[PDB]
């Protein structure tokens, strides 16, 4: 019907996917063996979206795990859900990129991209009518950001009319995890601008703050951050797996949101995030959903609204709720805050209501928002890159691997004109 082939490139992509498939299998009643023990018949009607059929009534995901070094996939395999993947889908090589975009894009990814292209051609053509692909990766690394965009470049030419989503993890303003991270960021953004229809910007300490303040967890883990990203990635595609009073797939969210084919970088958000001790201090209604949805402390990016203007906002609801309440909340949130929404678009909120919440919750919501204030991510990345590149700070680890300075120059100029275009649509009559 409408199937999604899920790609995960790099250590960040593999560790995100290892939790994404766990939360999806718990949502669809799939055990670690791979069988089905669902309590309702609605959990298997649309199991062909993510799961392929096997002999003996077994369900395997449409996952392609890509890594330059097989090190992270021992931890992926040894986990609780590591044995549900088909072993032919694991693609790996001999050496790693070592946080080098150039190595994983030119020298080490050029011979590993063929096997991945074969496995995605085999997986994509076992489908009835493919809707689109899906990539999870990070922009600061070398394999997930170098190979992760070569994959999109090769896939887009073969499938030019499908959906390419990228749940990317963007670099961090306060402290980093990679010294050469601005180079990888500016190189990967230049590919992500042309080659994707939807891109999700996810910041790490946005997740850290969310866990420490809105969840009030004393000691988190990267597993909790991956759970947040998995929950905000499952709720986007929840209207094409369950029925509802208003349906919206990936293409309906893409058409309603991007007004121009460049402004496709968004802000995720998950609204029912209760505290560890403050569950009894709330009366769960739709106004609290909207209030925690639009609170600027609840975004998944370190860049904020109230410095820019919302262009389009998505709101995918889950649960049995009334539609007058949802509609009046979205009317109030635009009317009462009339300066952070653009004036040339009369309605900036697209709403979708499904029927089945996540298991254990009564209602749910998933913010997706196109803001003109995403550009301070790109502005800061450009400032860090113009600090590093002008003095050839680490360029010899790239130019000796068959790169050229012109490629960094394209990668910077494209982001700078994207910043200029966001500024032009920031203020307009």
């Amino acid at each position: 019907m409408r199937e999604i082939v899920h790609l995960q490139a790099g250590q960040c992509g593999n560790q995100i996917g290892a939790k994404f498939w766990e939360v999806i299998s718990d949502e669809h009643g799939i055990d670690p063996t791979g069988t089905y023990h669902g309590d309702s018949d609605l959990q298997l009607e649309r199991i062909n979206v993510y799961y392929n059929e096997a002999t003996g009534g077994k369900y395997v995901p449409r996952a392609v795990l890509v890594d330059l070094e097989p090190g992270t996939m021992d931890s992926v395999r040894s986990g609780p859900f590591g044995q549900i993947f088909r072993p032919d889908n694991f693609v790996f090589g001999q050496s790693g990129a070592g946080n080098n975009w150039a190595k994983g894009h030119y020298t080490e990814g050029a011979e590993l991209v063929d096997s991945v292209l074969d496995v995605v051609r085999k997986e994509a053509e076992s489908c009835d009518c493919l809707q689109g692909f899906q990539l999870t990766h990070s922009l600061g690394g070398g394999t997930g950001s170098g190979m992760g965009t070569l994959l999109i470049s090769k896939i887009r030419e073969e499938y030019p009319d499908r959906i390419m989503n990228t749940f990317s993890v963007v670099p961090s303003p306060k402290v980093s995890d990679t010294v050469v991270e601005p180079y990888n960021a500016t190189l990967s953004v230049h590919q992500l601008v042309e080659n994707t229809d939807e891109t999700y910007c996810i910041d790490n300490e946005a997740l850290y703050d969310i866990c420490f303040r809105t969840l009030k967890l004393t000691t988190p883990t990267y597993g909790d951050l991956n759970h947040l990203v998995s929950a905000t990635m499952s709720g986007v595609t929840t209207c094409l797996r369950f029925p509802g009073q208003l349906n919206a797939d990936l293409r309906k969210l893409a058409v309603n949101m991007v007004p121009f084919p460049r402004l496709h970088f968004f802000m995720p958000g998950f609204a029912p995030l209760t505290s560890r001790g403050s569950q009894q201090y709330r009366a769960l209604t739709v106004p609290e959903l909207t209030q925690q949805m639009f609170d600027a402390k609840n975004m998944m990016a370190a860049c904020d609204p109230r410095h820019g203007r919302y262009l389009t906002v998505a709101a995918v609801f889950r649960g049995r709720m009334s539609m007058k309440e949802v509609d009046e909340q979205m009317l109030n949130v635009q009317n009462k805050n009339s300066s952070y929404f653009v004036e040339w678009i009369p309605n900036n909120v697209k709403t979708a209501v499904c029927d089945i919440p996540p298991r254990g919750l009564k209602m749910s919501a998933t913010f997706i928002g196109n803001s003109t204030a995403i550009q301070e991510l790109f502005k800061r990345i450009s400032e860090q890159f113009t600090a590093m590149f002008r003095r050839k700070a680490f360029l010899h680890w790239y130019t000796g691997e068959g790169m050229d300075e012109m490629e960094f120059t394209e990668a910077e100029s494209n982001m700078n004109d994207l910043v200029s275009e966001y500024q032009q649509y920031q203020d307009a009559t």
Partner: peptide, 28 residues
């Protein structure tokens, strides 16, 4: 362009290269 009995050939829209050549009808 495809190559033969590969997954890129049985595709909604593909071009498949033919067999290379033969030996006769040309001088040795």
């Amino acid at each position: 362009v495809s190559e033969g009995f590969t997954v890129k050939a049985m595709m909604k829209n593909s071009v498949v290269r033919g067999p290379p050549s033969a030996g006769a009808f040309k001088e040795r």
